């Protein structure tokens, strides 16, 4: 028992982190096979970040300008190219620690672990979610760019995020590993503001199921509701609309607990309308929404890698 | 910016996790050099857990009864012994992935990362704290015993916890790596209840400093207090007494923010007396107490390993 914000074991990714230096800028890169991926703004000066023409800036760079260091050993760069907002540095040595992996573009509401790194060295690991406004609420400082987010499937690391930018509001924006930003954000220091940070309803419900499994049940009530009635309430509180697809996804948690999905919606409805009244659920005083249904099943079962 | 419950990178520990099978029981072991550490209750049957005489139960076991598997390869056990509540299995091969390490017995209020494992395979990583009642609030299921807690110091893994027991209240108890339980708990299925779960005041204050650093400042007030006045309030709310040693430890965070320690105590005092009024601090609606002062400095600076 017990339920914790849990990240994936980070060892497989630790073995892929390298340092990339272009001029005086030092970011992180991801070394898979004989390619190193990093944010293209490694080539920019702090001044350039206001309106960079990356294509023009790249013309002044050659293979030998990209210094790539795996631990204490330098890697030899034998080619480079730009794909969207990432750079692909071809090196002459395959990473011997490359795990089985894939690149995945995740959907808002999906969760992933982030390995925060600086100068190519891991600093810590935490769990995040792609927010409905396509930001993530991370923990990133100068030089953290190029740190990646990922999920693990027994033996396969699915990379879904690479970190690029911090918005003036302190939230974070980045790309998939093909270099395409999540949401409308760009690798420019400009006026880009995040949209509404709506709450991920299906994740809240999964977490309420997690609570029931782990002993917390004071919020269960004698009521039920319908998808349309609930969604009327979800809208007033800036919650994602709940769909039949979401209901279907919660099926297994409903079976394991014997609480119908729509009964749990009625519990969530009452919590939204009346608050927590100073109580807590799984050690939180708010409704947590960065656990997916699959996360809850995984932690409450013990899936390994 | 941003502040997250952050665990240490787990790769160094992942390389030490093995499976230990005695009879039909399968737990986790920690493989360092040519020794494997695991909970002594690996030798117990479920029936035995009520009143086991481990010394007598061990007499029936020989080296070949302890099956140790690192991944898919079996390790040869050439000796075994009991030290307090752990078993030390001497194997004929040093772990090639052994990191620089130490065994440390931590104090209540200190934090550590836990690598949750099952059948010797890592499942996830999360951050914990030794509670003042010497429990930890973890996430553990059947077979998780032998999972360990640790801190990392650039290159040195300090092991501080090995998991043994879940109490009927759903909290967790375990030992240091010399096999000595934290608190009064025993590896017996019996009536052992946890004491008061008091709040770790110095950690709450560190986290409030973390909030100020990262933009959250609505709770700052125009007041101050004294150690004796504050501690009068800490007692009514089941908070640890704050000492001058705690004040000294918060010195660096006070300098970085320009907020005197006792001024921050007055802010915490008002939050205890009046609550949050429906607001949040660093995304929480309660006062978080599993970040140490050193944790806050580390995350807000970017220390690596
Ligand atoms: C732009 C970089 C990857 C990043 O996320 C950052 C840079 C500088 C500070 C102070 C914070 C975050
Ligand atoms: C005793 C073992 C290590 C443990 O922590 C546990 C065992 C069984 C369940 C259901 C939960 C936790
Ligand atoms: Cl909370």
């Amino acid at each position: 028992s017990g339920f914790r914000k849990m990240a994936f074991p980070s060892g497989k990714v630790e073995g892929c982190m390298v340092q990339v230096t272009c001029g005086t800028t030092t970011l992180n890169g991801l070394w898979l096979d004989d390619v190193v991926y990093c944010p293209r703004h490694v080539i920019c000066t702090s001044e350039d970040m206001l309106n960079p023409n990356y294509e023009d800036l790249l013309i002044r760079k050659s293979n030998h300008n990209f210094l790539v260091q795996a631990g204490n050993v330098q890697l030899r760069v034998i080619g480079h190219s730009m794909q969207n907002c990432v750079l692909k540095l071809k090196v002459d040595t395959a990473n011997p620690k490359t795990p089985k992996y894939k690149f995945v573009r995740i959907q808002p509401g999906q969760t992933f672990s982030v390995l925060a790194c600086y100068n190519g060295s891991p600093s810590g690991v935490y769990q995040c979610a792609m927010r409905p406004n396509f930001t993530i609420k991370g923990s990133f400082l100068n030089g953290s760019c190029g740190s990646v987010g990922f999920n693990i499937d027994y033996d396969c690391v699915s990379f879904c995020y690479m970190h690029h930018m911090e918005l003036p509001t302190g939230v974070h924006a980045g790309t998939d590993l093909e270099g395409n930003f999540y949401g409308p954000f760009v690798d420019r220091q400009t006026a880009q503001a995040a949209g509404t940070d709506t709450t991920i309803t299906v994740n809240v419900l999964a977490w309420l199921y997690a609570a029931v499994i782990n002993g917390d049940r004071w919020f269960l009530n004698r009521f039920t509701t319908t998808l349309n009635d609930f969604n009327l309430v979800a809208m007033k509180y800036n919650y994602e609309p709940l769909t039949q697809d979401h209901v279907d996804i919660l099926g297994p948690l409903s079976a394991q607990t014997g609480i119908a999905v729509l009964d749990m919606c009625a519990s969530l409805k009452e919590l939204l309308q009346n608050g927590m009244n100073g109580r807590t659920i799984l050690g939180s005083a708010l409704l947590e929404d960065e656990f997916t249904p699959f996360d809850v099943v995984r932690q409450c079962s013990g899936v390994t890698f």
Side-chain angles (χ1 to χ4, degrees), chain A:
Chain A
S1 178
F3 204 72
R4 277 279 188 190
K5 198 53 83 64
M6 185 181 285
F8 281 104
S10 58
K12 283 165 187 270
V13 181
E14 289 172 50
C16 301
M17 299 312 302
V18 300
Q19 196 189 233
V20 183
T21 303
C22 195
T24 66
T25 296
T26 298
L27 301 185
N28 307 275
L30 184 71
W31 185 19
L32 308 168
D33 297 319
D34 63 347
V35 176
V36 175
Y37 306 82
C38 71
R40 70 173 174 177
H41 74 58
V42 70
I43 72 182
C44 284
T45 88
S46 151
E47 180 218 308
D48 285 321
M49 287 312 299
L50 275 181
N51 194 39
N53 191 303
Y54 288 100
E55 293 86 343
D56 291 332
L57 287 172
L58 211 43
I59 289 175
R60 321 291 148 202
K61 303 314 182 85
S62 296
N63 289 338
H64 66 267
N65 294 123
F66 295 100
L67 300 170
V68 185
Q69 210 174 284
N72 194 65
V73 292
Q74 211 79 10
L75 294 174
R76 196 179 288 280
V77 179
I78 66 180
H80 65 275
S81 59
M82 200 176 42
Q83 182 187 4
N84 300 304
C85 295
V86 295
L87 293 186
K88 297 193 290 194
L89 306 176
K90 189 68 123 183
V91 295
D92 74 348
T93 302
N95 182 359
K97 311 185 180 160
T98 303
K100 178 190 204 214
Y101 73 93
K102 303 189 309 305
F103 294 164
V104 185
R105 193 178 172 76
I106 52 164
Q107 304 293 310
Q110 172 68 47
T111 55
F112 55 94
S113 305
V114 168
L115 182 65
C117 301
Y118 298 88
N119 305 306
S121 279
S123 176
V125 64
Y126 52 88
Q127 194 77 351
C128 286
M130 183 61 53
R131 304 301 316 175
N133 68 1
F134 290 103
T135 70
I136 73 171
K137 298 170 135 165
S139 179
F140 291 118
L141 300 164
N142 179 282
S144 65
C145 333
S147 301
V148 302
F150 60 96
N151 288 282
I152 309 198
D153 188 341
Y154 176 58
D155 56 332
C156 186
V157 183
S158 288
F159 294 102
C160 56
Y161 182 82
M162 177 170 278
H163 179 56
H164 288 243
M165 312 285 281
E166 186 172 82
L167 306 187
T169 42
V171 299
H172 302 112
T175 69
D176 59 29
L177 264 296
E178 291 162 18
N180 288 310
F181 264 89
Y182 288 99
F185 305 108
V186 294
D187 47 3
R188 267 150 197 73
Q189 187 182 336
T190 181
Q192 31 189 357
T196 307
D197 197 9
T198 56
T199 299
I200 308 152
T201 309
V202 66
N203 290 2
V204 175
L205 288 161
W207 168 79
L208 289 170
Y209 278 110
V212 174
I213 289 159
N214 287 278
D216 286 2
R217 287 128 185 200
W218 65 261
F219 54 87
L220 295 184
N221 66 21
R222 296 168 166 279
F223 321 131
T224 198
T225 183
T226 71
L227 258 197
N228 282 338
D229 176 71
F230 174 82
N231 277 333
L232 281 173
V233 175
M235 213 188 257
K236 321 307 169 254
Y237 290 93
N238 277 5
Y239 267 57
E240 262 211 317
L242 195 59
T243 68
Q244 189 57 49
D245 280 2
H246 293 146
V247 172
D248 292 348
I249 273 155
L250 289 158
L253 279 177
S254 168
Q256 197 178 3
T257 63
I259 293 153
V261 173
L262 283 172
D263 290 5
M264 193 62 92
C265 292
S267 273
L268 176 53
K269 170 170 166 207
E270 293 307 304
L271 284 159
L272 288 174
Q273 275 165 10
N274 301 104
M276 307 263 286
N277 287 118
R279 305 150 195 150
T280 59
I281 297 172
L282 287 178
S284 175
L286 44 79
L287 302 169
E288 302 285 339
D289 79 336
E290 299 204 345
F291 291 104
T292 74
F294 305 91
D295 290 339
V296 167
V297 165
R298 172 170 331 107
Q299 205 189 133
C300 292
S301 87
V303 178
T304 54
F305 318 98

Tab-separated table of all heavy atoms in Angstrom, chain A residues 38-41 43 53-59 66 79-89 178-179 187:
chain	number	residue	atom	x	y	z
A	38	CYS	N	20.157	17.209	-29.663
A	38	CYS	CA	20.179	18.305	-28.715
A	38	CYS	C	19.357	19.457	-29.260
A	38	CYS	O	19.025	19.484	-30.456
A	38	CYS	CB	21.606	18.767	-28.395
A	38	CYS	SG	22.468	19.633	-29.714
A	39	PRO	N	18.995	20.415	-28.417
A	39	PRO	CA	18.270	21.591	-28.908
A	39	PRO	C	19.128	22.397	-29.880
A	39	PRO	O	20.321	22.610	-29.655
A	39	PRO	CB	17.963	22.382	-27.627
A	39	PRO	CG	18.103	21.402	-26.506
A	39	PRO	CD	19.181	20.449	-26.953
A	40	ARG	N	18.514	22.834	-30.981
A	40	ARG	CA	19.256	23.630	-31.945
A	40	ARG	C	19.734	24.951	-31.349
A	40	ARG	O	20.712	25.520	-31.850
A	40	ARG	CB	18.409	23.871	-33.206
A	40	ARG	CG	17.225	24.793	-33.053
A	40	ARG	CD	16.584	25.058	-34.423
A	40	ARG	NE	15.359	25.837	-34.317
A	40	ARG	CZ	14.636	26.251	-35.351
A	40	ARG	NH1	15.007	25.967	-36.592
A	40	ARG	NH2	13.533	26.957	-35.132
A	41	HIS	N	19.085	25.454	-30.273
A	41	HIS	CA	19.553	26.731	-29.728
A	41	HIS	C	20.890	26.595	-28.975
A	41	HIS	O	21.366	27.598	-28.426
A	41	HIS	CB	18.457	27.426	-28.888
A	41	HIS	CG	18.171	26.832	-27.539
A	41	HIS	ND1	19.128	26.682	-26.556
A	41	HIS	CD2	16.994	26.468	-26.972
A	41	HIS	CE1	18.562	26.196	-25.465
A	41	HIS	NE2	17.269	26.049	-25.694
A	43	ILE	N	23.436	26.526	-30.600
A	43	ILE	CA	24.286	27.355	-31.452
A	43	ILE	C	24.082	28.840	-31.218
A	43	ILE	O	24.846	29.651	-31.757
A	43	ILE	CB	24.059	27.105	-32.956
A	43	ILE	CG1	22.716	27.690	-33.410
A	43	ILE	CG2	24.125	25.622	-33.266
A	43	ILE	CD1	22.405	27.441	-34.896
A	53	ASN	N	17.830	33.372	-36.831
A	53	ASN	CA	17.651	32.641	-38.087
A	53	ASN	C	18.574	31.427	-38.015
A	53	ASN	O	19.718	31.464	-38.467
A	53	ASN	CB	17.951	33.499	-39.309
A	53	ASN	CG	17.518	32.825	-40.600
A	53	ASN	OD1	17.940	31.708	-40.905
A	53	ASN	ND2	16.650	33.489	-41.351
A	54	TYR	N	18.063	30.344	-37.426
A	54	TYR	CA	18.891	29.176	-37.148
A	54	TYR	C	19.585	28.664	-38.405
A	54	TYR	O	20.748	28.247	-38.355
A	54	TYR	CB	18.032	28.084	-36.520
A	54	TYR	CG	17.634	28.403	-35.096
A	54	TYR	CD1	16.373	28.910	-34.792
A	54	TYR	CD2	18.528	28.205	-34.055
A	54	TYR	CE1	16.011	29.194	-33.485
A	54	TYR	CE2	18.180	28.484	-32.756
A	54	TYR	CZ	16.929	28.989	-32.469
A	54	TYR	OH	16.599	29.268	-31.161
A	55	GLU	N	18.888	28.690	-39.540
A	55	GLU	CA	19.496	28.251	-40.791
A	55	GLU	C	20.740	29.069	-41.118
A	55	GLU	O	21.779	28.512	-41.490
A	55	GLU	CB	18.472	28.342	-41.919
A	55	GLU	CG	17.311	27.359	-41.780
A	55	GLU	CD	16.179	27.880	-40.906
A	55	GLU	OE1	16.402	28.852	-40.154
A	55	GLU	OE2	15.067	27.311	-40.971
A	56	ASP	N	20.659	30.394	-40.976
A	56	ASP	CA	21.820	31.242	-41.238
A	56	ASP	C	22.896	31.032	-40.180
A	56	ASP	O	24.085	30.922	-40.504
A	56	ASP	CB	21.396	32.712	-41.290
A	56	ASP	CG	20.545	33.030	-42.505
A	56	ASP	OD1	20.696	32.345	-43.539
A	56	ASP	OD2	19.729	33.972	-42.425
A	57	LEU	N	22.493	30.951	-38.910
A	57	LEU	CA	23.461	30.731	-37.841
A	57	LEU	C	24.202	29.413	-38.016
A	57	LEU	O	25.385	29.315	-37.671
A	57	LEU	CB	22.755	30.753	-36.486
A	57	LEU	CG	22.277	32.103	-35.955
A	57	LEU	CD1	21.421	31.918	-34.706
A	57	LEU	CD2	23.455	33.017	-35.664
A	58	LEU	N	23.529	28.388	-38.542
A	58	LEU	CA	24.180	27.095	-38.710
A	58	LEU	C	25.254	27.137	-39.784
A	58	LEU	O	26.252	26.414	-39.684
A	58	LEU	CB	23.139	26.034	-39.063
A	58	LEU	CG	23.374	24.597	-38.607
A	58	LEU	CD1	23.872	24.487	-37.190
A	58	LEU	CD2	22.048	23.831	-38.768
A	59	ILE	N	25.071	27.964	-40.816
A	59	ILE	CA	26.032	27.996	-41.916
A	59	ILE	C	27.437	28.297	-41.408
A	59	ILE	O	28.430	27.919	-42.043
A	59	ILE	CB	25.596	29.026	-42.978
A	59	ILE	CG1	24.369	28.525	-43.744
A	59	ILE	CG2	26.741	29.313	-43.943
A	59	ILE	CD1	23.790	29.530	-44.724
A	66	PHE	N	31.151	21.507	-32.763
A	66	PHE	CA	30.243	20.875	-31.803
A	66	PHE	C	31.063	19.918	-30.946
A	66	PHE	O	31.414	18.822	-31.387
A	66	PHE	CB	29.105	20.142	-32.507
A	66	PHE	CG	28.185	21.047	-33.265
A	66	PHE	CD1	28.310	21.188	-34.634
A	66	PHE	CD2	27.196	21.758	-32.603
A	66	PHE	CE1	27.464	22.021	-35.340
A	66	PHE	CE2	26.345	22.598	-33.302
A	66	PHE	CZ	26.483	22.731	-34.673
A	79	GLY	N	29.311	14.548	-38.710
A	79	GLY	CA	28.249	15.130	-39.485
A	79	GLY	C	27.242	15.783	-38.558
A	79	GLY	O	27.137	15.440	-37.387
A	80	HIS	N	26.511	16.741	-39.121
A	80	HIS	CA	25.471	17.412	-38.366
A	80	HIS	C	24.357	17.852	-39.305
A	80	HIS	O	24.577	18.130	-40.488
A	80	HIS	CB	26.021	18.622	-37.589
A	80	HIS	CG	26.529	19.736	-38.457
A	80	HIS	ND1	27.812	19.758	-38.960
A	80	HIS	CD2	25.934	20.873	-38.893
A	80	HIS	CE1	27.980	20.850	-39.686
A	80	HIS	NE2	26.856	21.543	-39.663
A	81	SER	N	23.152	17.935	-38.745
A	81	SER	CA	21.998	18.401	-39.496
A	81	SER	C	20.947	18.918	-38.528
A	81	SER	O	20.954	18.599	-37.335
A	81	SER	CB	21.395	17.302	-40.382
A	81	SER	OG	20.982	16.186	-39.615
A	82	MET	N	20.051	19.739	-39.062
A	82	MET	CA	18.939	20.289	-38.306
A	82	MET	C	17.663	19.585	-38.745
A	82	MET	O	17.384	19.490	-39.944
A	82	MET	CB	18.811	21.796	-38.525
A	82	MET	CG	18.023	22.513	-37.431
A	82	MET	SD	17.968	24.310	-37.607
A	82	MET	CE	17.697	24.500	-39.371
A	83	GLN	N	16.909	19.069	-37.779
A	83	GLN	CA	15.564	18.549	-38.020
A	83	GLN	C	14.605	19.316	-37.114
A	83	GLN	O	14.613	19.118	-35.896
A	83	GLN	CB	15.489	17.042	-37.769
A	83	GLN	CG	14.109	16.464	-38.064
A	83	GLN	CD	13.978	15.012	-37.662
A	83	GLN	OE1	14.897	14.431	-37.088
A	83	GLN	NE2	12.827	14.413	-37.962
A	84	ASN	N	13.797	20.202	-37.702
A	84	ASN	CA	12.901	21.048	-36.923
A	84	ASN	C	13.737	21.787	-35.887
A	84	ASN	O	14.675	22.499	-36.260
A	84	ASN	CB	11.778	20.197	-36.339
A	84	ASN	CG	10.969	19.506	-37.439
A	84	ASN	OD1	10.439	20.168	-38.341
A	84	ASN	ND2	10.912	18.184	-37.397
A	85	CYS	N	13.423	21.658	-34.601
A	85	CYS	CA	14.109	22.453	-33.596
A	85	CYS	C	15.188	21.683	-32.858
A	85	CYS	O	15.680	22.162	-31.833
A	85	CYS	CB	13.106	23.025	-32.596
A	85	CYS	SG	11.950	24.205	-33.331
A	86	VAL	N	15.599	20.525	-33.364
A	86	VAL	CA	16.711	19.804	-32.766
A	86	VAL	C	17.837	19.688	-33.781
A	86	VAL	O	17.633	19.779	-34.994
A	86	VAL	CB	16.311	18.404	-32.253
A	86	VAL	CG1	15.316	18.516	-31.113
A	86	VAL	CG2	15.758	17.535	-33.389
A	87	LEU	N	19.040	19.478	-33.261
A	87	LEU	CA	20.204	19.144	-34.064
A	87	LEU	C	20.513	17.665	-33.890
A	87	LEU	O	20.392	17.124	-32.787
A	87	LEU	CB	21.419	19.972	-33.656
A	87	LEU	CG	21.379	21.474	-33.935
A	87	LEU	CD1	22.739	22.061	-33.591
A	87	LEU	CD2	21.016	21.747	-35.386
A	88	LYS	N	20.912	17.017	-34.981
A	88	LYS	CA	21.354	15.627	-34.967
A	88	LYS	C	22.842	15.629	-35.301
A	88	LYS	O	23.234	15.979	-36.419
A	88	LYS	CB	20.545	14.791	-35.951
A	88	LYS	CG	19.069	14.734	-35.605
A	88	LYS	CD	18.357	13.662	-36.395
A	88	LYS	CE	18.243	14.036	-37.864
A	88	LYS	NZ	17.260	13.164	-38.581
A	89	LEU	N	23.665	15.276	-34.318
A	89	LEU	CA	25.112	15.221	-34.477
A	89	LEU	C	25.507	13.766	-34.696
A	89	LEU	O	25.370	12.934	-33.794
A	89	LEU	CB	25.809	15.812	-33.256
A	89	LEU	CG	25.362	17.223	-32.865
A	89	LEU	CD1	26.044	17.655	-31.578
A	89	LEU	CD2	25.642	18.209	-33.996
A	178	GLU	N	11.700	14.368	-32.586
A	178	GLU	CA	11.840	14.811	-33.964
A	178	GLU	C	11.971	16.323	-34.052
A	178	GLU	O	12.078	16.860	-35.158
A	178	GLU	CB	10.665	14.322	-34.816
A	178	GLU	CG	10.692	12.811	-35.022
A	178	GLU	CD	9.361	12.239	-35.467
A	178	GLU	OE1	8.508	13.007	-35.953
A	178	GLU	OE2	9.167	11.012	-35.332
A	179	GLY	N	12.002	17.017	-32.914
A	179	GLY	CA	12.239	18.439	-32.884
A	179	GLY	C	11.013	19.303	-33.058
A	179	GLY	O	11.154	20.515	-33.268
A	187	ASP	N	11.340	28.319	-30.237
A	187	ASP	CA	12.619	28.524	-29.551
A	187	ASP	C	13.157	29.933	-29.836
A	187	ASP	O	14.211	30.148	-30.444
A	187	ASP	CB	13.625	27.432	-29.911
A	187	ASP	CG	13.713	27.137	-31.402
A	187	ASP	OD1	13.047	27.811	-32.216
A	187	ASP	OD2	14.486	26.215	-31.757
